[PDB]
């Protein structure tokens, strides 16, 4: 009945300013009652309010940054703007927005998936993408592990998925761990039937958006050869 | 402002106990003239946005099992829920809307109790295409075991080996409560190439013997 979509540049430098958007379906700050507001949460911390706006443009914000955040809406009533000059690392964190569930109070009825910003003068940086084969050592009573390698990629996130969404039952993708060489790296590990290998056709579809990467991997079993061995 | 406690931090519970989590307000947030109290409580699970449970206290949304009921009035709020479900595990923040500037909880952790449950272990040698590039990564994957405490060795040539190996661990699943969990040891190519035998072995508090893969480097 209602949708929410947060955009935004994935990483800016310090004391540059974000500017992120809110894109929303099936209700519009052109009608009464309708309001938009930002919360935000750095990674495995809590949620802080940051700002929000209402149909007749009155608008709200934290006074821990308020002198930073400049919020707006569009003139087609589609869309929320939020801007925080001068960022620093701080500001490193998922922003979401959220429409107020009130015509008057400020709760919080439907959110966006967020989007992830990063506050940092490193270089942005795309992934290997390496495959993991299946054989016997991937392989337990009737089930095989297959995979893929995203390495060495900088910021976060990537998204991976298996034969362009096809494939999701039994997929394990691991949260990124960022290594000291300021890079992350994370494997995305399926389990599929053994008696499959041969027949089907198993391709990982990984997105680094801040670089622009893109690559659809076919990841071919790689059966071992045991020499002097019965 | 007005600062909202949470209590417990975290709890973990298995499927069907009830479960009662407490969020404490610094002021009182029941509005003399209406008698109405200014709380919501989210859910948010793994990977997601918060999502919208209870308004004014006690209201649920749309949409929410009737399993969950807030309760309370004034500082001290209580969200129950009657018979926890296996996707129920999530952090729970409760937020006050009664004055500028709107302020939530710190959050509590619902964890899911289970059955132990042994892992299946798969490892993977380096790619002939990351060995091409210049790296080695051994990768070894535990799949579907509970508790989420596992410890993973890595032997090289019959030796322990601890540095440079990198753990992660998926979220608790919804729907079976286990977890799963990677364990990269990452080499040179020439530091790779100058051993045999690699092994990755789990042990848990379902075995006194290890689930083990081993492979080696050439025999393929
Ligand atoms: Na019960």
């Known amino acids: 009945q209602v949708t929410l979509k947060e955009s935004g540049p994935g990483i800016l430098q310090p004391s540059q300013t974000l500017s992120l958007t809110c894109s929303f379906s099936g209700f519009s700050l052109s009608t009464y009652g309708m309001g938009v507001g930002w919360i935000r949460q750095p990674s495995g911390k809590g949620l802080e309010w940051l700002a929000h706006i209402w149909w007749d443009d009155v608008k709200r914000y934290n006074p821990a940054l308020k002198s930073r955040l400049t919020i707006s809406k569009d003139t087609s009533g589609s869309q929320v703007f939020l801007k925080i000059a001068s960022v620093d690392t701080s500001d490193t964190a998922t922003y979401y927005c959220a429409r107020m569930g009130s015509d008057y109070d400020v709760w919080f009825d439907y959110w966006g998936q967020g989007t992830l910003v990063t506050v940092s003068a490193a270089s942005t940086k795309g992934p290997s993408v390496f495959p993991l084969a299946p054989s016997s050592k991937s392989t337990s009573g009737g089930t095989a592990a297959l995979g893929c390698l995203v390495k060495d990629y900088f910021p976060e996130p990537v998204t991976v998925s298996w034969n362009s969404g096809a494939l999701t039952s039994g997929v394990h993708t691991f949260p990124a761990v960022l290594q000291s060489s300021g890079l992350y790296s994370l494997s995305s590990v399926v389990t599929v039937p053994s008696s499959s290998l041969g027949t089907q056709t198993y391709i990982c579809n990984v997105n680094h958006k801040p670089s622009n990467t893109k690559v659809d991997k076919k990841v071919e079993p790689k059966s071992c050869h045991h020499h002097h061995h019965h | 402002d007005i600062v909202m406690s949470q209590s417990p931090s975290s709890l973990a519970v298995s499927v069907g106990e009830k479960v009662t989590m407490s969020c404490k307000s610094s002021?009182?947030?029941?509005?003399?003239?209406?008698?109405?109290?200014?709380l919501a409580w989210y859910q948010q699970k793994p990977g997601q946005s918060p999502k919208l449970l209870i308004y004014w206290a006690s209201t649920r949304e749309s949409g929410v099992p009737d399993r969950f009921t807030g309760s309370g009035s004034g500082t001290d709020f209580t969200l129950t829920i009657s018979s926890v479900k296996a996707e129920d595990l999530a952090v729970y923040y409760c937020?006050?809307?009664?004055?500028?500037?709107?302020?939530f909880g710190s959050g509590t952790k619902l964890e899911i109790k289970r059955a132990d449950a042994a892992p299946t272990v798969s490892i993977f040698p380096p790619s002939s295409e990351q060995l091409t590039s210049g790296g080695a990564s051994v990768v070894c994957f535990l799949n579907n075991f509970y508790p989420r405490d596992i410890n993973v060795k890595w032997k090289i040539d019959g030796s322990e080996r601890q540095n440079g190996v990198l753990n992660s661990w998926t979220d608790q699943d919804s729907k079976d409560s286990t977890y799963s969990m990677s364990s990269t040891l990452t080499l040179t190519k020439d530091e790779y190439e100058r051993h045999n035998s690699y092994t990755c072995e789990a042990t848990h508090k379902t075995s006194t013997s290890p689930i083990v893969k081993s492979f080696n480097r050439n025999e393929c």
């Open positions: 937020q006050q809307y009664y004055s500028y500037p709107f302020t």
């Open positions: 002021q009182s947030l029941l509005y003399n003239n209406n008698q109405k109290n200014y």
